């Protein structure tokens, strides 16, 4: 006998209990998590994708068009864009041995630069931030 039985759980105030989730999701996009040069030190080219950020940003981007339906969708099409060390996300997705070799011929102060990259791209993330204060 193939059955197998599973405990329902109450229905109530789906809307309002599905606002409250999506609020959640907003919150793991503002906490972020990503390494830097500590690991991107020799590793920099070595960690190419993990769900670092973009994609779980990207599911409670979902949740924003569905319950905001307005035009702050397009805006986070927008986010999802960004060049970050001259390159796209596109060519940041994987590792290239032309990237490798010019990574060690570059020093830490040239990772600065590049680091640097990084900064403006963090506070581009803190522009869709100020989408809470409107």
Known sequence: ?????????????????????????????????????????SNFPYLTVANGSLRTIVTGLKGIVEF???????????????QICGV??????????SARDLVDNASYQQEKIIIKHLNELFEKVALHLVGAEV
């Open 88 to 97: 796209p996300f596109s060519q940041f997705g994987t590792c290239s041995g």
């Open 1 to 41: 006998g193939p059955e197998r039985i599973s405990k329902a759980y109450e229905s109530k105030d789906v809307r309002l209990v599905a606002r409250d989730s999506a609020f959640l999701g907003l919150q793991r996009a503002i906490r972020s998590e990503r390494f830097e040069l500590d690991n991107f030190k």
């Open 68 to 82: 905001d339906d307005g035009q702050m969708k397009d805006i986070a099409k927008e986010i999802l864009d960004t």
